[PDB]
């Protein structure tokens, strides 16, 4: 717990440094917020375009021209501007589903990841996922995924089962391993080698069929308890 | 100076036979980068690093220790 | 078989409209940003078309490769582990796929940022890290585990005690091996297997032709060759006739782009679904019923296909 406390406490710290000096993290949010003001400018500038009409100031036609020609010109403005809206409206509808699709991805992570513990691999972030902490950000959300990444490997000789008397003992949960002499049944995602006793291992079949099985003695819990 | 790509005609950057992570991706796996005195190089990106796991039918590798990495999404 | 990326394509918002002609170039300047909002759009696709391919295929830190000698316990992956012979190294299956699925008006086709021999290094890595290391290369450094002791940890995931495996191992290999071959005959004789991928590649090429033919249409303008209206008429007349061309040849682009945006956001969805299978199904083992295919799910093997990915569940 101690070592885990520090590894987490530190881990939060480094975030603030990734966030302090760097603008690359928030690109997603930032890229969205631009694409709007992007379009709006585009949408605004489209006012000052001629669109083929004599001028883009709607009343500087009307001074120049007697209405029946303006009525012809103001079309090319309307027809121009109107179309320019739909092109903007569409681009919102399309983009609004590019968010709407991301909402559901958050609305999921907010449920499964935060409120639960998500078995889905590399959904809740690379590694095994412990929990997650949401944080709001403008027009967006930021999850801090606390993930569990294993570290220090050690090679080991393994065997898929063990012959005791000709019965085959298989590990209930975890692998058989050995460091080269003694046989240890350990859990898979962390190394805690334990003597092999019949409560680690369930009997199944017998020894001729298995491919790879090795000899050993699987210790009896009970047999010592006997002799007195 | 002139190079020739699979992507197109690249001009102003130097070829490099080495291969590093992709940096300013261009086309057909030619990733320009400014690392080098300096100049702009262009080098075929090697996807990732390289590794080959040591595999044998009795060989298992169990992590003895872990980290905790708070990511950000 | 999932579409992953579509064909990255830009377009010249000017030449496409006004071929080779400044007379028409002016009257485009009137409409302003309708030229460059397009290239702003069509690029914002071709930008991410390599984000799609990125998220899907590169979930793996390092490019692994198989050990030299294959003994996996009787499973035969020689079908799917990359062919050393073909210079592009694409495991025997993927070369099937690449047989199935198959420069003018400003229309370009940009090169996909990752060439196949790259994509086929990843889907070699993934496929070759899944074998030895199991899922542990998605959670960290790849941890070699005997493939025959792997499957026993993919039976504990479907609720079958592992002693089923080792005793039935042989039979399972033959059931696995034999099951691979069919996939090669399945794919071999039928072009309606890949139709999805085949349809994407069609829909684009379907849309491009549609876009190109528009250059031959009158739109009420007396000709579809811009040079004509220029030559026979005096400018103040051509000022109008060229509008309808421009208007048409513009309103034909917005139609075209708005398609691509939609269609891309369809691919953008299918990519995320693939990158979800690649993450959940390939790397780990999936508990999500019928997400990884009819039946309980043991593992999955990705295989690239042109503008797509193909899983063997
Ligand atoms: C493998 O690990 C086991 C247990 O950690 C080791 O067994 C013990 O090793 C120590 C090392 O000096 C001995 O003092 C003990 O007597 C051993 N236990 C028994 C019950 O004999 C074993 O030595 C390790 N093997 C290697 C090669 O390191
Ligand atoms: C595990 O140990 C058993 C003995 O407990 C070995 O079985 C012997 O194998 C030899 C090989 O020819 C036979 O001649 C003996 O008759 C076997 N013993 C019995 C009691 O039948 C077995 O070979 C060992 N397995 C491994 C992998 O070393
Ligand atoms: C597991 O790995 C961690 C590294 O994340 C080790 O942490 C260090 O352990 C040393 C022990 O010599 C301490 O002096 C350091 O203070 C630790 N560093 C941090 C950042 O906490 C840890 O010791 C390892 N545990 C085992 C059992 O190997
Ligand atoms: C794995 O499968 C491949 C192809 O199915 C096998 O390659 C064949 O091997 C036989 C040997 O009896 C030859 O007659 C064929 O000509 C080979 N085919 C090709 C295309 O090369 C390979 O032997 C199998 N290996 C294992 C271990 O199952
Ligand atoms: C296990 O053996 C392989 C093969 O020599 C080696 O590459 C690997 O580094 C070994 N494991 C460790 C933890 O060093
Ligand atoms: C493991 O492989 C080695 C060589 O690859 C071989 O000698 C041995 O018989 C194999 N044993 C098992 C159980 O796979
Ligand atoms: C790469 O090596 C070749 C020789 O095989 C050489 O001709 C070429 O100049 C080298 N590239 C660079 C950038 O020097």
The number of residues making up chain A comes to 228
The number of residues making up chain C comes to 313
Geometric angle at alpha carbon A208, from A206 and A172, rounded to 5°: 40
Geometric angle at alpha carbon C234, from C233 and C240, rounded to 5°: 80
Report which bound ligand comes closest to the CA of A158. Answer: 6
CA distances from A185 to A86, C121, C167 (A): 67, 36, 20
3-class secondary structure for A65-109? CCHHHHHHHHHHHHHHHHHHHHHHHHHHHHHHHHHHHHHHHHHHH
Three-class DSSP category at B72: coil
Report which bound ligand comes closest to the CA of A2. Answer: 3
Spatial separation of the C-alpha atoms in residues C191 and C101, rounded to whole Å: 9
Chains near B, with 3+ CB pairs < 8 A? Answer: A, C
Contacts of C110 in chain B (CB under 8 A): 27
Spatial separation of the C-alpha atoms in residues C220 and C10, rounded to whole Å: 28
Ligand 7 touching residue B40 (CB < 6 A): no
Q: At a CB cut-off of 8 Å and minimum separation 6, what does B73 contact?
A: A109, A125, A142, A143, A145
Q: What is the dihedral of CA A109, A114, A119, A122, to 10 degrees?
A: 50
Ligand 3 touching residue A5 (CB < 6 A): no
Of C207, C209, C208, C229, which Cα lies nearest the Cα of C220?
Answer: C229
B57–C71 CB contact, under 8 Å: yes
Q: What is the dihedral of CA C160, C162, C166, C169, to 10 degrees?
A: 30
Other C-beta atoms closer than 10 Å to the C-beta of A112 total 17
Q: What are phi and psi of C115, to 5 degrees?
A: -65, 160
Report which bound ligand comes closest to the CA of B17. Answer: 7
Task: Give exposure, C11-37, as e/b (b: 16+ Cβ within 10 Å).
Answer: bebbebbbbebeebeebbebbbbbbeb
A148 close to C138: Cβ distance less than 8 angstroms: no
Q: CB-based burial of residue C91 (10 Å sphere; 0-12 exposed, 13-18 middle, 19+ buried)?
A: buried
Question: Which among C58, C112, C147 is the nearest to B47, CB-wise?
Answer: C58
Q: What technique solved it?
A: cryo-EM
Ligand 7 touching residue B71 (CB < 6 A): no
Spatial separation of the C-alpha atoms in residues B57 and C73, rounded to whole Å: 8
A186–B62 CB contact, under 8 Å: yes
Select from A5, A107, A125, A180 the residue whose CB has the most chain B CBs within 10 Å, as the one to mutate to test that interface: A125
CA distances from C10 to B41, B67, C46, C114, C264 (A): 26, 45, 7, 17, 13
Spatial separation of the C-alpha atoms in residues A213 and C162, rounded to whole Å: 14
Ligand 7 touching residue B15 (CB < 6 A): yes
Pairing of strands A214-215, A162-163: parallel
C58 close to C71: Cβ distance less than 8 angstroms: no
Spatial separation of the C-alpha atoms in residues A133 and C313, rounded to whole Å: 34
Spatial separation of the C-alpha atoms in residues B36 and A29, rounded to whole Å: 33
Pairing of strands C308-312, A183-186: unpaired
Spatial separation of the C-alpha atoms in residues C307 and C6, rounded to whole Å: 6
Contacts of C236 in chain A (CB under 8 A): none
Spatial separation of the C-alpha atoms in residues A173 and A192, rounded to whole Å: 12
Q: A227: distance to nearest CA of chain C, Å?
A: 33
**In this structure, what DSSP letter does residue C32 have?**
G
Other C-beta atoms closer than 10 Å to the C-beta of C193 total 18
Select from C167, C242, C292 the residue whose CB has the most chain A CBs within 10 Å, as the one to mutate to test that interface: C167
Contacts of B49 in chain C (CB under 8 A): 61-63
**Tokens linked to C134:** 């199991």
Task: Give exposure, B15-46, as e/b (b: 16+ Cβ within 10 Å).
Answer: ebeeeeebeebbbbbbbbbeeeeeeebbbbbb
Whether the CB of B2 is below 8 Å from some CB of chain C: the reply is: no
Contacts of B45 in chain C (CB under 8 A): 118
Pairing of strands B14-15, A214-215: unpaired
Spatial separation of the C-alpha atoms in residues A90 and A69, rounded to whole Å: 32
Give the bridge partners for A143, in sequence order. A134
Of C63, C5, C43, C72, which Cα lies nearest the Cα of C305?
Answer: C5
Spatial separation of the C-alpha atoms in residues C301 and C284, rounded to whole Å: 12
Rounded-to-5 percentages of helix, strand, coil across chain C: 55, 5, 40
Q: Which residue of A has its CA nearest to C142?
A: A153
A51 close to A80: Cβ distance less than 8 angstroms: yes
A146 close to B70: Cβ distance less than 8 angstroms: yes
Q: Which residue of C has its CA nearest to B50?
A: C63
Other C-beta atoms closer than 10 Å to the C-beta of A55 total 15
Spatial separation of the C-alpha atoms in residues A101 and C11, rounded to whole Å: 27
**Tokens linked to B11:** 């001009």
Distance of CA B41 to the CA centre of its chain: 13
Kind and range of the H or E element at A215?
Answer: strand A214-215
A121–C32 CB contact, under 8 Å: no
CA dihedral sign of residues C146, C148, C151, C155 = negative
Q: What are phi and psi of A203, to 5 degrees?
A: -65, 140
Spatial separation of the C-alpha atoms in residues C263 and C198, rounded to whole Å: 15
Q: What are phi and psi of B15, to 5 degrees?
A: -65, 155
Q: What is the dihedral of CA A36, A39, A40, A42, to 10 degrees?
A: 160
Give the bridge partners for B31, in sequence order. B25, B43
Report the residue among A1, A3, A154 best suited for mutation to probe ligand 3: largest number of ligand atoms under 8 A from its CB.
A3
Whether the CB of C141 is below 8 Å from some CB of chain A: the reply is: yes
Q: What own/partner pairs with CB < 8 Å and gap ≥ 24 does A46-49 have?
A: A46/A80, A46/A81, A46/A84, A46/C32, A46/C33, A47/A81, A48/C32, A49/A80, A49/C30, A49/C31, A49/C32, A49/C33
Select from A154, A173, A189 the residue whose CB has the most chain B CBs within 10 Å, as the one to mutate to test that interface: A154
Give the bridge partners for B11, in sequence order. B2
Spatial separation of the C-alpha atoms in residues A150 and A127, rounded to whole Å: 8
Determine the distance separating the centroid of ligand 3 and the alpha carbon of C296, expressed in angstroms. 40
**Tokens linked to B24:** 């300013």
Of C173, C69, C75, C56, which Cα lies nearest the Cα of C122?
Answer: C56
Pairing of strands A140-150, B41-44: unpaired
Q: CB-based burial of residue A125 (10 Å sphere; 0-12 exposed, 13-18 middle, 19+ buried)?
A: buried
Geometric angle at alpha carbon A62, from A60 and A68, rounded to 5°: 145
Give the bridge partners for C107, in sequence order. none
Q: CB-based burial of residue C127 (10 Å sphere; 0-12 exposed, 13-18 middle, 19+ buried)?
A: buried
Q: What own/partner pairs with CB < 8 Å and gap ≥ 24 does C183-189 have?
A: C183/C93, C183/C312, C184/C79, C184/C92, C184/C93, C184/C96, C187/C93, C187/C96, C187/C97, C187/C100, C188/C96
CA distances from C104 to A76, C14, C209, C260 (A): 31, 14, 11, 19
């Amino acid at each position: 717990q101690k070592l885990i406390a520090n590894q987490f406490n530190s881990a939060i710290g480094k975030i603030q440094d990734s966030l302090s000096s760097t603008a690359s993290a928030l690109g997603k949010l930032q890229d969205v917020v631009n694409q709007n003001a992007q379009a709006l400018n585009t949408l605004v500038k489209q006012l000052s375009s001629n669109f083929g009409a004599i001028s883009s100031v709607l009343n500087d036609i009307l001074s120049r021209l007697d209405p029946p020609e303006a009525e012809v010109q103001i079309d090319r403005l309307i027809t121009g501007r109107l179309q320019s809206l739909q092109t903007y409206v569409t681009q919102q509808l399309i983009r609004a589903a590019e968010i709407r699709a991301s909402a559901n991805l958050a609305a999921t992570k907010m449920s499964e990841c935060v409120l639960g513990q998500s078995k889905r691999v590399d959904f809740c972030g690379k590694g095994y996922h412990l929990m997650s902490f949401p944080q709001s950000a403008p027009h967006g959300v930021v999850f801090l995924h606390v993930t569990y990444v294993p570290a220090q490997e050690k090679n080991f000789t393994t065997a898929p089962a063990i012959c005791h008397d000709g019965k085959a003992h298989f590990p209930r949960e975890g692998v058989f391993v050995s460091n080269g002499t003694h046989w240890f049944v350990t859990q898979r995602n962390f190394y805690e080698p334990q003597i092999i006793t019949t409560d680690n291992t369930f009997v199944s079949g017998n020894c001729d069929v298995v491919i790879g099985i090795v000899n050993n003695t699987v210790y009896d819990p009970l047999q010592p308890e006997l002799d007195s | 100076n002139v190079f020739q790509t699979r992507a197109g005609c690249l001009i102003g950057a130097e070829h490099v036979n080495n291969s590093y992570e992709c940096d300013i991706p261009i086309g057909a796996g030619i990733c320009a980068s400014y690392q080098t005195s300096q100049s702009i190089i262009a080098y075929t990106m090697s996807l990732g690093a390289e590794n080959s796991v040591a595999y044998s039918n009795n060989s298992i590798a169990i992590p003895t220790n872990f980290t905790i990495s708070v990511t950000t999404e | 078989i999932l579409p992953v990326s579509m064909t990255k394509t830009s377009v010249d918002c000017t030449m496409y409209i006004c071929g080779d002609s400044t007379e028409c170039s002016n009257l485009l300047l009137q409409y302003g940003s309708f030229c460059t909002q397009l290239n702003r759009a069509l690029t914002g696709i071709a930008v991410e078309q390599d984000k799609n391919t990125q998220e899907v295929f590169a979930q793996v830190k390092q490019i692994y490769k198989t050990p030299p000698i294959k003994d996996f316990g009787g499973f035969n992956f020689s079908q799917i582990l990359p062919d050393p012979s073909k210079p592009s190294k694409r495991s025997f299956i993927e070369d099937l796929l690449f047989n199935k699925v198959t420069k003018f008006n400003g229309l370009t086709v940009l090169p996909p940022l990752l060439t196949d021999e790259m994509i086929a290094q990843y889907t070699s890595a993934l496929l070759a890290g899944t074998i030895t290391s199991g899922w542990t290369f998605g959670a960290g450094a790849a941890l070699q585990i005997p493939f025959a002791m792997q499957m026993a940890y993919r039976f504990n995931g479907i609720g079958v005690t592992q002693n089923v495996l080792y005793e039935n191992q042989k039979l399972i290999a033959n059931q696995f091996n034999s099951a691979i071959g069919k996939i090669q005959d399945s794919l071999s004789s039928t072009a309606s297997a890949l139709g999805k991928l085949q349809d994407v590649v069609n829909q684009n090429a379907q849309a491009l032709n549609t876009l190109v033919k528009q250059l031959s249409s009158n739109f009420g303008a007396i000709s579809s060759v811009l040079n004509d209206i220029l030559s026979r008429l005096d400018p103040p007349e051509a000022e109008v006739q060229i509008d309808r061309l421009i208007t048409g040849r513009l309103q034909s682009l917005q139609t075209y782009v708005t398609q691509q945006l939609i269609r891309a956001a369809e691919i953008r969805a299918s990519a995320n679904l693939a990158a979800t299978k690649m993450s959940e199904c390939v790397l780990g083992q999936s508990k999500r019923v019928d997400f990884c295919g009819k039946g309980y799910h043991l593992m999955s093997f990705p295989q690239s296909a042109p503008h797509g990915v193909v899983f063997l569940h």
